[PDB]
Short mmCIF file of C-alpha atoms and ligand atoms in Angstrom, two decimals:
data_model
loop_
_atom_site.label_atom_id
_atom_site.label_comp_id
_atom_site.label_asym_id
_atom_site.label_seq_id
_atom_site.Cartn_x
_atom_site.Cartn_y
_atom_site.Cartn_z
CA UNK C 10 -60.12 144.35 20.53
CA UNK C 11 -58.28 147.15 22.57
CA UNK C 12 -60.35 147.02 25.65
CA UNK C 13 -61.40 143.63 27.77
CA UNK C 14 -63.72 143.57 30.58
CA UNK C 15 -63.15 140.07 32.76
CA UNK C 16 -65.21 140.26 36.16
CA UNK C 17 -65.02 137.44 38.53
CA UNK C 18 -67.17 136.28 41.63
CA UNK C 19 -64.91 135.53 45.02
CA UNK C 20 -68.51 134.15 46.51
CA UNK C 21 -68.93 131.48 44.25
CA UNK C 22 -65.47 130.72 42.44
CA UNK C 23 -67.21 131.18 39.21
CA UNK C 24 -67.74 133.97 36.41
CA UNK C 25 -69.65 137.05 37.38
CA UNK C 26 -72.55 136.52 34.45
CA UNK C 27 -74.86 139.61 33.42
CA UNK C 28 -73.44 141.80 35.08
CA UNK C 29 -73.62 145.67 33.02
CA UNK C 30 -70.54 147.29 32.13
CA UNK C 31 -70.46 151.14 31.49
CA UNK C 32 -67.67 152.68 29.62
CA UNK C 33 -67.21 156.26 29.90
CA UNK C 34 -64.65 159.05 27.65
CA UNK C 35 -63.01 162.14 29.45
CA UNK C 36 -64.25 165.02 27.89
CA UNK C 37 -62.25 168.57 27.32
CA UNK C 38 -64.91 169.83 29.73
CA UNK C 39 -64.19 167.61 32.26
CA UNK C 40 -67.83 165.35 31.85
CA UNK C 41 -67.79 161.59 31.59
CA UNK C 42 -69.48 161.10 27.79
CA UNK C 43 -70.90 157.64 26.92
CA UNK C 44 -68.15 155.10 24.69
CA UNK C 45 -69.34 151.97 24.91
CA UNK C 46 -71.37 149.53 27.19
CA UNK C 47 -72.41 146.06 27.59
CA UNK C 48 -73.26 142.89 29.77
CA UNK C 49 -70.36 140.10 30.83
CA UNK C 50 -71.22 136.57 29.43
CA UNK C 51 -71.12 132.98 30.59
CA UNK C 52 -67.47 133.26 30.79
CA UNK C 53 -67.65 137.17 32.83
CA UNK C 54 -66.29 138.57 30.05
CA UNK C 55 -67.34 141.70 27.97
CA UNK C 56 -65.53 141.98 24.81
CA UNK C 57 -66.08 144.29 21.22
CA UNK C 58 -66.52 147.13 23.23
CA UNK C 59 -64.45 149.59 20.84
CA UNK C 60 -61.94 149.04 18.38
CA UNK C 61 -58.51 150.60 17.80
CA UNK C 62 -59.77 153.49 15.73
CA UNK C 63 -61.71 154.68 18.01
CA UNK C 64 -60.20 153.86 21.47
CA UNK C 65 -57.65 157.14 21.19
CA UNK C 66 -55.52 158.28 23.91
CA UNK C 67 -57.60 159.91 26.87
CA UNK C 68 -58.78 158.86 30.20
CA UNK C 69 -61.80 156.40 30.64
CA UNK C 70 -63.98 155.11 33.25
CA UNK C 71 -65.02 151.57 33.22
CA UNK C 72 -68.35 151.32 35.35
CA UNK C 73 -68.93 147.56 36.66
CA UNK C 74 -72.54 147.38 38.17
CA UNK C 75 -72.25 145.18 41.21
CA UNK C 76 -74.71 146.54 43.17
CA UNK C 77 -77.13 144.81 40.56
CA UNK C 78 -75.34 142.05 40.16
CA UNK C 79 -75.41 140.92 44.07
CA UNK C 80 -78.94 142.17 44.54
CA UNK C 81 -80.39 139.62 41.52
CA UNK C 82 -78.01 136.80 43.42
CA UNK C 83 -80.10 137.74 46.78
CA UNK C 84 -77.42 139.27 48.50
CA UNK C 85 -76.37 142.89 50.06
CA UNK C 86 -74.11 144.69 49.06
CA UNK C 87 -71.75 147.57 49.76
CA UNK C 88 -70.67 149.42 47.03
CA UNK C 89 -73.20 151.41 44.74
CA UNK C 90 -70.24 150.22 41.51
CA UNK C 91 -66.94 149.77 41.07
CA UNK C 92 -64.60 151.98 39.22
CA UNK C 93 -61.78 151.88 37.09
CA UNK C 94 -60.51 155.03 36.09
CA UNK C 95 -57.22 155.15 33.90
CA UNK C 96 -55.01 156.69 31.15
CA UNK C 97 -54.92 155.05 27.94
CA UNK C 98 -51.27 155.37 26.39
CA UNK C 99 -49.87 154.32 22.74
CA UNK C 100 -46.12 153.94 24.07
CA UNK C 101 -47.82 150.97 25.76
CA UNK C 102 -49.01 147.72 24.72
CA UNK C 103 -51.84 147.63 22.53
CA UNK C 104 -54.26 145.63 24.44
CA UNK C 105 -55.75 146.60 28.00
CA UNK C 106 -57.83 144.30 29.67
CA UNK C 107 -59.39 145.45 32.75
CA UNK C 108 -59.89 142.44 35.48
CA UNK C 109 -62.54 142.78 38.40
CA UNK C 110 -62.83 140.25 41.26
CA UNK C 111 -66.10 140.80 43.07
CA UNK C 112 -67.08 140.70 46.83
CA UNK C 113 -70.25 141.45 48.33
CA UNK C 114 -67.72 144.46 50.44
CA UNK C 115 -64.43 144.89 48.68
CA UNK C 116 -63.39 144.45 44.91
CA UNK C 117 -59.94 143.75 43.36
CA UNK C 118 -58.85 145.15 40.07
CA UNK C 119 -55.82 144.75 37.92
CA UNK C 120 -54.87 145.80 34.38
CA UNK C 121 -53.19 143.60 32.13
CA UNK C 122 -51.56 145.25 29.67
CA UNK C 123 -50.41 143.48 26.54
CA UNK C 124 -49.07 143.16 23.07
CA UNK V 10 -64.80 159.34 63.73
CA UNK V 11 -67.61 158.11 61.48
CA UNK V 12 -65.60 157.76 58.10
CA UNK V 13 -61.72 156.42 58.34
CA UNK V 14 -59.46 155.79 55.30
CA UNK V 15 -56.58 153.05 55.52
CA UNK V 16 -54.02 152.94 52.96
CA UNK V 17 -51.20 150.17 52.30
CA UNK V 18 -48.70 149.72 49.53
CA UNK V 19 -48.30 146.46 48.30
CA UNK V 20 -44.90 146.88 46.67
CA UNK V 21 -43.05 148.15 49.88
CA UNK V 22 -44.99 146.49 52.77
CA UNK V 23 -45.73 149.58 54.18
CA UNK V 24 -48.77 152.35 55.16
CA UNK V 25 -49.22 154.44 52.05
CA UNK V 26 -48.52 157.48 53.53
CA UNK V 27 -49.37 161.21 52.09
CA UNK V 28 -52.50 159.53 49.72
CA UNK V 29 -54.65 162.52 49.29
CA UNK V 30 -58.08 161.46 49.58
CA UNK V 31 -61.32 163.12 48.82
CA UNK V 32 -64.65 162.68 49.45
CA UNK V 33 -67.72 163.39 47.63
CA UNK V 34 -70.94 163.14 48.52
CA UNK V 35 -73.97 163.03 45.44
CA UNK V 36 -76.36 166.50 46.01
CA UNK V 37 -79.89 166.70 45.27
CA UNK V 38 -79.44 167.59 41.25
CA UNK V 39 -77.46 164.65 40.93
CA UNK V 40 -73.77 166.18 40.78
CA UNK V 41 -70.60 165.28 42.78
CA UNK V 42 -70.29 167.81 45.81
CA UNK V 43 -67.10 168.22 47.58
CA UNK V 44 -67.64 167.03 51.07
CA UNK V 45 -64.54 166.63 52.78
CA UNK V 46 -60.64 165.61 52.28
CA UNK V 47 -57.58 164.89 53.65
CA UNK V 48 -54.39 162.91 53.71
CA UNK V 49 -52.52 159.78 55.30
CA UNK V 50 -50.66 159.79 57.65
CA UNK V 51 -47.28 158.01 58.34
CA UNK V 52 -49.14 154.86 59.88
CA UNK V 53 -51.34 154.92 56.68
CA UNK V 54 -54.22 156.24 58.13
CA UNK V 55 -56.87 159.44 57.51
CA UNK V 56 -59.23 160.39 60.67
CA UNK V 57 -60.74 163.40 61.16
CA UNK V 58 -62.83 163.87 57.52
CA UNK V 59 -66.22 164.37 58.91
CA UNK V 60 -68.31 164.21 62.14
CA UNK V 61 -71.50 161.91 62.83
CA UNK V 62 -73.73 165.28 62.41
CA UNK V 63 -72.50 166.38 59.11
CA UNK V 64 -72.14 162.70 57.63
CA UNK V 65 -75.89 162.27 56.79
CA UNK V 66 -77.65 159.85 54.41
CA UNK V 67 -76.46 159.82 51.42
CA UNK V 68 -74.27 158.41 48.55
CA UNK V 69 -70.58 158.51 48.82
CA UNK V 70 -67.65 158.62 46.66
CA UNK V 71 -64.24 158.31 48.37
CA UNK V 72 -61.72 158.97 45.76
CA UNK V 73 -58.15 158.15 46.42
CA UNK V 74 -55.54 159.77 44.82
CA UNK V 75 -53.64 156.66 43.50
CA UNK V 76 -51.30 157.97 40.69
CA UNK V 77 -50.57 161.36 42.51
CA UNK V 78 -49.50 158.94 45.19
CA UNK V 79 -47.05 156.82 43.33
CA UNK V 80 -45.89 159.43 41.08
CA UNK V 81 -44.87 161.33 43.99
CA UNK V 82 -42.44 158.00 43.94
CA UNK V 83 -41.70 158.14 40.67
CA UNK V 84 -43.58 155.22 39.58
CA UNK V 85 -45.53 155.57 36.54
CA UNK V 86 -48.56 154.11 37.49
CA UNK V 87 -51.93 152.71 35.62
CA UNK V 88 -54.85 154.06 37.37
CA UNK V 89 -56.03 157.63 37.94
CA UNK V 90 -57.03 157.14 41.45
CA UNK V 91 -59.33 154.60 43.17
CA UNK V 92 -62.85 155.25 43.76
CA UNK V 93 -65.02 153.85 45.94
CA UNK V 94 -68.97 154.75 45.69
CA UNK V 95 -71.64 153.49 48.60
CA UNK V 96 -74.48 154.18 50.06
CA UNK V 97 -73.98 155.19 53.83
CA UNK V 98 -75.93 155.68 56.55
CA UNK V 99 -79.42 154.36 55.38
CA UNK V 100 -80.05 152.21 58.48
CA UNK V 101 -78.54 154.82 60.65
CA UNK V 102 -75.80 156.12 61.74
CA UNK V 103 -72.72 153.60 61.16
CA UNK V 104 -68.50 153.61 61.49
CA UNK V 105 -66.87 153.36 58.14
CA UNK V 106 -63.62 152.32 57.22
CA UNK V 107 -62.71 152.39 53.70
CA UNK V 108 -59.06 150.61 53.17
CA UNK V 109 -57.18 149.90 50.37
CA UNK V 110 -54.24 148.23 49.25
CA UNK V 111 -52.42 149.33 46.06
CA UNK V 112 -50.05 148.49 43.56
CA UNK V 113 -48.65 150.11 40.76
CA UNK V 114 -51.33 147.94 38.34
CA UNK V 115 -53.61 147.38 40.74
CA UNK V 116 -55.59 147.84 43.82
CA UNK V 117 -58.01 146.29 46.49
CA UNK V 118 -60.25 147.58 48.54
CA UNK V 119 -62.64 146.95 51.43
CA UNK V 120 -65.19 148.37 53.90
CA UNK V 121 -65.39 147.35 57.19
CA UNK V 122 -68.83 149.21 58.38
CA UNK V 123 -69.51 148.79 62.32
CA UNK V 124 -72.88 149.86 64.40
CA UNK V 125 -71.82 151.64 67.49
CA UNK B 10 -45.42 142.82 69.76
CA UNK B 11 -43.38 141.32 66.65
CA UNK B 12 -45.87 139.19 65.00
CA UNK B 13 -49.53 140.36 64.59
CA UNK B 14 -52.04 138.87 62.28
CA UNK B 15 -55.35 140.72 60.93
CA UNK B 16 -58.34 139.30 59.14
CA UNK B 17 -61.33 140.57 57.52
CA UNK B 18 -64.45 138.92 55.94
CA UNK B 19 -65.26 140.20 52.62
CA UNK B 20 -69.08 138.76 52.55
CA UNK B 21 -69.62 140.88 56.01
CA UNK B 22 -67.67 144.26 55.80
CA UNK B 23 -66.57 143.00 58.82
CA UNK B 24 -63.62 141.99 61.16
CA UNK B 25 -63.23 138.04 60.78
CA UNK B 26 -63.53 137.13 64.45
CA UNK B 27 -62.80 133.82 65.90
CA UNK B 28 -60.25 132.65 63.25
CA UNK B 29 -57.82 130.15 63.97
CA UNK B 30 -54.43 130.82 63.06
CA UNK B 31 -51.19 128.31 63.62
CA UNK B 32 -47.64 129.48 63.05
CA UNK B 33 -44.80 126.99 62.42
CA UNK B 34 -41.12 127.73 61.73
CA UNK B 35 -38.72 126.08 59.61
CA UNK B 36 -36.52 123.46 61.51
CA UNK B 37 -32.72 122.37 60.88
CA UNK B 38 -34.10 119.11 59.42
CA UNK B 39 -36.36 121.20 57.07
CA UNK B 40 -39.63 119.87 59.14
CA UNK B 41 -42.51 122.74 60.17
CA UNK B 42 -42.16 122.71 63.69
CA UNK B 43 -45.03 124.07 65.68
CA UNK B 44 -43.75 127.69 66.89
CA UNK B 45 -47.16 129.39 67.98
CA UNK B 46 -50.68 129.38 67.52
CA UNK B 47 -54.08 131.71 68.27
CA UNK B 48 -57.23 133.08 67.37
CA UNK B 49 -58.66 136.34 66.49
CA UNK B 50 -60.46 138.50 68.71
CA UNK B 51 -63.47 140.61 67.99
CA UNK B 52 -61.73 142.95 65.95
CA UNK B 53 -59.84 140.23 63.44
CA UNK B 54 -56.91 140.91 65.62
CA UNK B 55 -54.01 138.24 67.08
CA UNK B 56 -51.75 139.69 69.18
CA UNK B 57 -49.26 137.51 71.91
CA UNK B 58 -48.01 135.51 69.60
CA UNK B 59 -44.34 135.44 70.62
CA UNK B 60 -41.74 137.52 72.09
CA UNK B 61 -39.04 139.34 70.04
CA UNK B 62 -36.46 136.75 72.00
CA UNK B 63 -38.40 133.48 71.10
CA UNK B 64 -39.04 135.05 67.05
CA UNK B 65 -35.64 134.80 65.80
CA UNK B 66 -34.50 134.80 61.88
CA UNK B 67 -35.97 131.48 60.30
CA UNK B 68 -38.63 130.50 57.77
CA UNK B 69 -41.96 131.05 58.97
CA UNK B 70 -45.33 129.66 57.77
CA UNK B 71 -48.59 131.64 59.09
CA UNK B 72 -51.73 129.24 58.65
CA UNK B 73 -55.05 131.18 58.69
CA UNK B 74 -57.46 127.95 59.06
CA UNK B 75 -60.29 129.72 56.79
CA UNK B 76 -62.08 126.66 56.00
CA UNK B 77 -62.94 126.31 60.00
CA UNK B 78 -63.83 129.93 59.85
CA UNK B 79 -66.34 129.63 57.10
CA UNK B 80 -67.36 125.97 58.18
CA UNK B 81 -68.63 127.72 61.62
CA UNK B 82 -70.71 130.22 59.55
CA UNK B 83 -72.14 127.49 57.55
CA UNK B 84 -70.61 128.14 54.04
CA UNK B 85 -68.34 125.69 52.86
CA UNK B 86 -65.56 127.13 51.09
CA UNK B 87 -63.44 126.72 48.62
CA UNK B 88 -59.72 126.66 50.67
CA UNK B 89 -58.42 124.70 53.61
CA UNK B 90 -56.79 127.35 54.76
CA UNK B 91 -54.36 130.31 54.01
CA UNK B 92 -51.03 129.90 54.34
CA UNK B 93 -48.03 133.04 54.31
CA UNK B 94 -44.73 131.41 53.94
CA UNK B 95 -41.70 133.79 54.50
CA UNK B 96 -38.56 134.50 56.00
CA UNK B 97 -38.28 137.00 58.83
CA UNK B 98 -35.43 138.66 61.17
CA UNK B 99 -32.56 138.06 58.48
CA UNK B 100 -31.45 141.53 58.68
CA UNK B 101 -32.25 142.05 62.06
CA UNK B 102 -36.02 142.45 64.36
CA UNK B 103 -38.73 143.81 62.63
CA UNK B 104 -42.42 143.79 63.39
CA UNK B 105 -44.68 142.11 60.94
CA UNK B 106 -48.15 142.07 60.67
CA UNK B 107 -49.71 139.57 58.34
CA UNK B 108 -52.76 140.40 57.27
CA UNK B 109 -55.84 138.75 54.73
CA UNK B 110 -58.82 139.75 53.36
CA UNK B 111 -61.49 136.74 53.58
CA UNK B 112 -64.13 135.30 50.76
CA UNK B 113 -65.68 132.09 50.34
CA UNK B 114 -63.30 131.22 46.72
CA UNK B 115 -60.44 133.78 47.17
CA UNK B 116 -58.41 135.71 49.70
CA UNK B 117 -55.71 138.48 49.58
CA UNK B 118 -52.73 138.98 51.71
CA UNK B 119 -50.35 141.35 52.64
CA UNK B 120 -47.68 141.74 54.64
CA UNK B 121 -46.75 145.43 57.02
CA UNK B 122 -42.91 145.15 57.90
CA UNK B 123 -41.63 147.79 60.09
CA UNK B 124 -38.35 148.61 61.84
CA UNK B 125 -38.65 149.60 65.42
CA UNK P 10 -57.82 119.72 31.28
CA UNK P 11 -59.47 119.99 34.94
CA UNK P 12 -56.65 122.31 36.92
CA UNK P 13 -55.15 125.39 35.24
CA UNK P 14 -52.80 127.92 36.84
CA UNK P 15 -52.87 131.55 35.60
CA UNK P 16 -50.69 134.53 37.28
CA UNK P 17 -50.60 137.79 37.06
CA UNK P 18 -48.51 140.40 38.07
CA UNK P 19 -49.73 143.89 39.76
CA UNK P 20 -46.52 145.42 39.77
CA UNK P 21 -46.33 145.41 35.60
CA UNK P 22 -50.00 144.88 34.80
CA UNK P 23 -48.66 141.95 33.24
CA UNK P 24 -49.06 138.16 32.75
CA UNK P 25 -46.19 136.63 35.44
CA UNK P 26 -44.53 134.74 32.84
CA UNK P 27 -41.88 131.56 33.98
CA UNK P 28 -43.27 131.39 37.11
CA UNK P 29 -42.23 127.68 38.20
CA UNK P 30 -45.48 125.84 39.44
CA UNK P 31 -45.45 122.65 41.53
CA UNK P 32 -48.73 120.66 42.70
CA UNK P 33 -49.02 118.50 45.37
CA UNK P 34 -51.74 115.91 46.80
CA UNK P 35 -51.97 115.52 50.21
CA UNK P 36 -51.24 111.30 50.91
CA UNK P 37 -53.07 109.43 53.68
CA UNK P 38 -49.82 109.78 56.35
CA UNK P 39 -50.49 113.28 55.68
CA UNK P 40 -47.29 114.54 53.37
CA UNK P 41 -47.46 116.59 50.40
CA UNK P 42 -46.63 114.00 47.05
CA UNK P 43 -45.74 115.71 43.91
CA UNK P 44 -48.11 115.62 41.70
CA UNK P 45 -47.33 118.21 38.76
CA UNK P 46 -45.18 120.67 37.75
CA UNK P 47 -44.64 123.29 34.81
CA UNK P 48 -43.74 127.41 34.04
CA UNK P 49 -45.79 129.75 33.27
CA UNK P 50 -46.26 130.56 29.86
CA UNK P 51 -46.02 133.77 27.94
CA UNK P 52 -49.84 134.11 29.07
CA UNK P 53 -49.23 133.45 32.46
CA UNK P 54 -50.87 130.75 32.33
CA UNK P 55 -50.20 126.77 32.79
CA UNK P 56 -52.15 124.18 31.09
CA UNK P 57 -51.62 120.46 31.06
CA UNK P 58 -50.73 119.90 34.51
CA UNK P 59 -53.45 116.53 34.72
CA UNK P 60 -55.77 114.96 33.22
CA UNK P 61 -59.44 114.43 34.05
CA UNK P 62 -58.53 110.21 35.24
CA UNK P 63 -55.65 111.44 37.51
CA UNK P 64 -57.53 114.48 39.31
CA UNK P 65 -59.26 112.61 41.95
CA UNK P 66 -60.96 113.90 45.25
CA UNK P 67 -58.24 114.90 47.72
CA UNK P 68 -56.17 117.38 49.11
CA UNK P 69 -54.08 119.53 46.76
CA UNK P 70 -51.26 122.15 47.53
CA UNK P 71 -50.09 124.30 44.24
CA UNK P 72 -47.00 126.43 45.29
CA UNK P 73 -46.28 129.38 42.82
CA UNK P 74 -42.34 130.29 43.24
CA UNK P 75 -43.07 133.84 43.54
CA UNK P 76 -39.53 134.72 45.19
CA UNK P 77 -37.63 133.88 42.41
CA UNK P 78 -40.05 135.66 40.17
CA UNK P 79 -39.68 138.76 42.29
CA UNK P 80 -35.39 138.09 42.39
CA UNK P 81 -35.16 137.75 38.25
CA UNK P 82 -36.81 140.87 37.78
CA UNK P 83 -34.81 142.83 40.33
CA UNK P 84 -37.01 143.55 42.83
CA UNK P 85 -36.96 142.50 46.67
CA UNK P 86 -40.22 140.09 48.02
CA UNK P 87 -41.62 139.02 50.93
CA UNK P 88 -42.93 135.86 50.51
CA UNK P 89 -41.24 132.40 50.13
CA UNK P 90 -43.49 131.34 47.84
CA UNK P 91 -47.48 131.91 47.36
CA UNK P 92 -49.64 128.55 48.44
CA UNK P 93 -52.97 127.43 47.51
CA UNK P 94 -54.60 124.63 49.42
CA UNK P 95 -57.93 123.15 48.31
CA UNK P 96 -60.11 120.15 48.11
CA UNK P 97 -61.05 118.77 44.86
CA UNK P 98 -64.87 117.50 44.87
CA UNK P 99 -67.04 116.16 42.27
CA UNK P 100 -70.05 117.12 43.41
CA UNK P 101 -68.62 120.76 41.88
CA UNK P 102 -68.28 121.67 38.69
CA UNK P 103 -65.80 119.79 36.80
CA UNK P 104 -62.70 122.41 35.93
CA UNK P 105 -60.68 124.27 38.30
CA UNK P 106 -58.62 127.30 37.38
CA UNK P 107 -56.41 128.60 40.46
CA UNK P 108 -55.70 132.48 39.77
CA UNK P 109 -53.17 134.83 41.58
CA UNK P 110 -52.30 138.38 41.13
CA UNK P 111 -49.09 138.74 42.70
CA UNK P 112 -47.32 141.86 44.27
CA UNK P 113 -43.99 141.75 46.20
CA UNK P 114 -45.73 141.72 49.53
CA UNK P 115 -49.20 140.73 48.58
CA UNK P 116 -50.78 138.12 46.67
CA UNK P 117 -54.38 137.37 46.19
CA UNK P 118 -56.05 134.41 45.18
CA UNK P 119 -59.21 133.12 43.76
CA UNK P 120 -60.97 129.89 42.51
CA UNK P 121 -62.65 129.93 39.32
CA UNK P 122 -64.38 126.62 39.34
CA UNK P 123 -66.39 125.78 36.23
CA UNK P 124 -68.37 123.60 33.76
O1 R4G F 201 -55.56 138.07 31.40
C1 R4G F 201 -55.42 137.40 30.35
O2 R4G F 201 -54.46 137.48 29.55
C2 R4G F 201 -56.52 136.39 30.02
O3 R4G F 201 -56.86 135.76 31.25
C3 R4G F 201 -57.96 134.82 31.12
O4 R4G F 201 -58.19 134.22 32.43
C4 R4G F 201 -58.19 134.87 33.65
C5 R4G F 201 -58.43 134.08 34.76
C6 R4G F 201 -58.39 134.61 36.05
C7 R4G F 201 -58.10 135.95 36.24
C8 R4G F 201 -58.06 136.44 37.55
C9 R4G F 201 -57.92 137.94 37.84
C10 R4G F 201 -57.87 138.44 39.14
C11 R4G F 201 -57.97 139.81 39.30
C12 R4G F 201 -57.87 140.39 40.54
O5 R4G F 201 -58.09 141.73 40.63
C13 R4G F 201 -57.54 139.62 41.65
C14 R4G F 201 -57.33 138.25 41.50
O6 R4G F 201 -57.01 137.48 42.58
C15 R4G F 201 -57.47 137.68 40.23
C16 R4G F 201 -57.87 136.76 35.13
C17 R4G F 201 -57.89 136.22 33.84
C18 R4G F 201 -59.17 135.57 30.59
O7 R4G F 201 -60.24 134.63 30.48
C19 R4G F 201 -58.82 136.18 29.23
O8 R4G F 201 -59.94 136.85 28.67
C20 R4G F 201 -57.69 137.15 29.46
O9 R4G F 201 -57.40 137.61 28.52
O1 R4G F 202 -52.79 151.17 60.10
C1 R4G F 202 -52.99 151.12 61.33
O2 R4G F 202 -52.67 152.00 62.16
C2 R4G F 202 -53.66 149.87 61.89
O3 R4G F 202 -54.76 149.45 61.06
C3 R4G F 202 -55.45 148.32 61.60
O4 R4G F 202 -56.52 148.01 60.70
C4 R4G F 202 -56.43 147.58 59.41
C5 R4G F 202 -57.66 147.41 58.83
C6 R4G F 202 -57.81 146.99 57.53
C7 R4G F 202 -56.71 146.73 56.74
C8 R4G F 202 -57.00 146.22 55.48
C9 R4G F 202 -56.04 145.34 54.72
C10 R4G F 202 -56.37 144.87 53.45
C11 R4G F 202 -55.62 143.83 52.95
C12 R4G F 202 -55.88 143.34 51.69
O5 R4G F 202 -55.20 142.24 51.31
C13 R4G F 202 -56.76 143.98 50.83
C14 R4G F 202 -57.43 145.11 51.26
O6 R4G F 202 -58.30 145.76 50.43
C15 R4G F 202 -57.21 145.57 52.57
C16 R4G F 202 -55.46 146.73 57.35
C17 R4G F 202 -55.31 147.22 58.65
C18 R4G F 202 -54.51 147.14 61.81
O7 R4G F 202 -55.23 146.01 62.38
C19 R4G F 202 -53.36 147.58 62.67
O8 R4G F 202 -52.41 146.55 62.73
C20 R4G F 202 -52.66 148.75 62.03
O9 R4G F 202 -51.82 149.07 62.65
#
């Protein structure tokens, strides 16, 4: 599993549940094509997204749907997404997982890059 | 000034200063139009990207040039830049401050939206 | 002005106004000694702290008292309050601002050091 | 195991490995009483700290020792330490992990408080 989504909620010190990931692959053209997608579970996490073979080098875009995600919690929000945009590298560490912690008007986001 | 970026760096304790930033705003077909952009300045800052005629209703994507920056300090870092997509305007005209504070790993940001 | 704190609510997009914020100092006997205290103003701002003659090197703890901030919005939180423990003026004045980035089960803060 | 520690670190989009950890509870004359202590694991995480018959309502203080984090690896940091103060209630869901992504003049916090 090369690529972990974790999203957290800074409202209610808990998971952010159901909330719709979108994965996107650089193209040579410049276009954001589809790679992979899913929901976070009880624990706000989204894994088997892609696997090794096919997670090559290349800049992605990890979509996090928090608009959606405060609106079914009753509450407005700022931010249409959030976006994590990045370079994946093999002279790295094998394993990227991209962390999200969620406010209805700001977002945090780390990578945590590991072996 | 209807749209204001603020910048920090995290590792130094300092403005981020010289982040390019640029602005996009979403057109009628759906694609990313170039709207306005800009740089910080030495206390961090960018003022002067738009004015309350031009910055109408619509969705936003203020895109800040996070690796150019740190490269620039020969850094390395992880992300590409930041981006940060909204809505604006839709209740009227409002004051928008996007800021952000980064890291080489990492990054926060925030709005702080006032009526005037 | 050599010690400024700033505060923003992350629920609101908003300054956090009214926030109550006590600074104590390290003593010789290793006791926090009251050194200062305030609250923030309409735009999350604290200025008048102290003076550059009455902030002199020592070990300085910054309490933002978050769970009174929330508790006055009727939220209950998840913190008492925020505290920023560091050392300042060891290699001469500077000019701090401390500032943090408010929700109900988290905060963020960062510290602007300059050198007048 | 109802309090866990995990830390990050923004600068290497790491886990903040051998981070020392010390917990206090807050007595009735108002000090700070240890309470537990560890490191970080190779994670960045610290498990163990109490059990569920020791964790009772109160006060608690858990200093992260993020100076001498920043001072092994080289690299010059602002804060002392990084302290999170909190009441522990039962009326909330029974486990309590304290997270914090640390930078050399910045650290956030959150509360990811679960069943
Ligand atoms: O990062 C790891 O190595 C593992 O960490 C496990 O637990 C947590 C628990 C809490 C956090 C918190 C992340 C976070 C991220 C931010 O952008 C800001 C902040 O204050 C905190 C991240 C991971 C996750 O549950 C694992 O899936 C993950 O692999
Ligand atoms: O840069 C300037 O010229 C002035 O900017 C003023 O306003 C802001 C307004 C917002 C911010 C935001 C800080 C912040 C801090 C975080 O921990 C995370 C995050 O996403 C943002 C910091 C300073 C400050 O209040 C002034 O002290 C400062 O001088």
């Amino acid at each position: 599993c090369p690529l972990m989504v974790k999203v957290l909620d800074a409202v209610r010190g808990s998971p952010a549940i159901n909330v719709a990931v979108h994965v996107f692959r650089k193209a040579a053209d410049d276009t954001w094509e589809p790679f992979a997608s899913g929901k976070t579970s009880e624990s706000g996490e989204l894994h088997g997204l892609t696997t090794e073979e096919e997670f090559v080098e290349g800049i992605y875009k990890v979509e996090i749907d928090t608009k959606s995600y405060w609106k079914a919690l009753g509450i407005s929000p700022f931010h249409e997404h959030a976006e994590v945009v990045f370079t994946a590298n093999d002279s790295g560490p094998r394993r990227y997982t991209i962390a999200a912690l969620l406010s209805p008007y700001s977002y945090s986001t780390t990578a945590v890059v590991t072996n």
